[PDB]
Amino acid sequence: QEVQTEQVTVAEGGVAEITCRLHQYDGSIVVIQNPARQTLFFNGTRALKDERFQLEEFSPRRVRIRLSDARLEDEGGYFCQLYTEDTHHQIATLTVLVAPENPVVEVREQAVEGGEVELSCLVPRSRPAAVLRWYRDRKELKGVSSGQENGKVWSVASTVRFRVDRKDDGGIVICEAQNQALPSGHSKQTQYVLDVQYSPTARIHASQAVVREGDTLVLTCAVTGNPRPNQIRWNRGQESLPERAEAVGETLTLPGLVSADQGTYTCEAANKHGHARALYVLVVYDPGAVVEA
């Protein structure tokens, strides 16, 4: 009685081959059993009504059967019993692997400037347990990883935190994960685009650099902000805007300018994190006589 055992691996759902080397073949019965000791093939004849198992080579050198659609319920010792006197076993132990699923990044709570960001990353099924690395703008971030085994498979998590100003918004964070079921130095990756809120800022830009009587001027208020601000209010100190002024959204349109329409106009925009205000000093030029420069 002799027993020899090779090892044999699959990625889940995959396809595995079981070679049963036979040294010199008289012709004697060859049986193959699943790990529940149930006989797949008694010699050539199929003898388990499960059609994922197909028989490939039965040649004076070896026997080969193929399991397609591997599952975690297919691990175990695959017995290759050659029935001579005496009998001789080959036990191919199948180990099925789950390559980590795409990582999933979430933020705990909204990124606010000055405040902080709490980013998490979760592979829910890995076998072996994954390794989670964080990269941001091609440098690696240090995380706090920890897994748990829900059967044969591992859910791993890793949670990084850091500080954000308004520059950091729109920026990309990469969680990558890798283990054995993937080629060495490969990985699955997932890119999370930051979202930092910030207090707004406004600034006015004018249609013309020199405004003369009887012209039509359009000021434009150049707001930024996250959330972006949704209303703009236009003002002229404690005074009415020129009649015929058009304050529509983010533009004041002054037409037929006359020298009494002068003054400093302001646009003013706010979101939940602050206010902003900008200030254009209007000056209507004429052919009259001016103080010297």
Partner 1 sequence: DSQPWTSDETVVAGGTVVLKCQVKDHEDSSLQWSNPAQQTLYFGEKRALRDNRIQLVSSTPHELSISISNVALADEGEYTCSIFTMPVRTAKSLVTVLGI
Ligand X SMILES: *[C@@H]1O[C@H](CO[C@@H]2O[C@@H](C)[C@@H](O)[C@@H](O)[C@@H]2O)[C@@H](O[C@@H]2O[C@H](CO)[C@@H](O)[C@H](O)[C@H]2NC(C)=O)[C@H](O)[C@H]1NC(C)=O
Query: For residues 16-75, which are near partner 1 according to CB under 8 A?
Result: 28-29, 31, 33, 37-39, 42-43, 45, 47-50
Q: Binding partner of residue 180 among ligand X, partner 1, a copy of itself, none, CB under 5 to 8 Å per kind? A: a copy of itself
Burial (CB count <10 Å: 0-12, 13-18, 19+), residue 101: middle
Contact by Cβ (8 Å): 154, 128: yes
CB of 146 to a copy of itself, least distance (A): 4
180 binds a copy of itself (CB under 8 A): yes
Distance CA 244, CA 240 (A): 11
Sequential DSSP letters for 117-166: EEEEEEEEEEBS--EEEEEETTEEEP--EEEEESSSSEEEEEEEEEE--T
Work out which of 87, 149, 193, 230 binds a copy of itself, going by CB under 8 A: 149
5 binds partner 1 (CB under 8 A): no
| DSSP-assigned letter for residue 6 | -
Work out which of 29, 144, 172, 222 binds a copy of itself, going by CB under 8 A: 144
| DSSP-assigned letter for residue 74 | G
Distance CA 95, CA 12 (A): 9
Size of the site for partner 1 (CB under 8 A): 19
Cα–Cα distance list, 108 to 11, 160, 161, 164, 230 (Å): 33, 11, 10, 14, 26
Q: Binding partner of residue 145 among partner 1, ligand X, a copy of itself, none, CB under 5 to 8 Å per kind? A: a copy of itself
Distance CA 267, CA 208 (A): 18
Phi, psi of 77 (to 5 degrees): -80, 120
Among 27-35, 163-171, 244-252, 285-293, the segment contacting ligand X (CB under 6 A): 27-35
Size of the site for a copy of itself (CB under 8 A): 17
x/- map, 53-82, ligand X, by CB under 6 A:
-----x-x----------------------
Distance CA 40, CA 20 (A): 13
Residues near a copy of itself (CB under 8 A) are: 5, 7, 128-129, 131, 144-149, 154, 158, 179-180, 184-185
Residues near ligand X (CB under 6 A) are: 27-30, 43-44, 58, 60
Residues near partner 1 (CB under 8 A) are: 28-29, 31, 33, 37-39, 42-43, 45, 47-50, 81, 83-85, 87
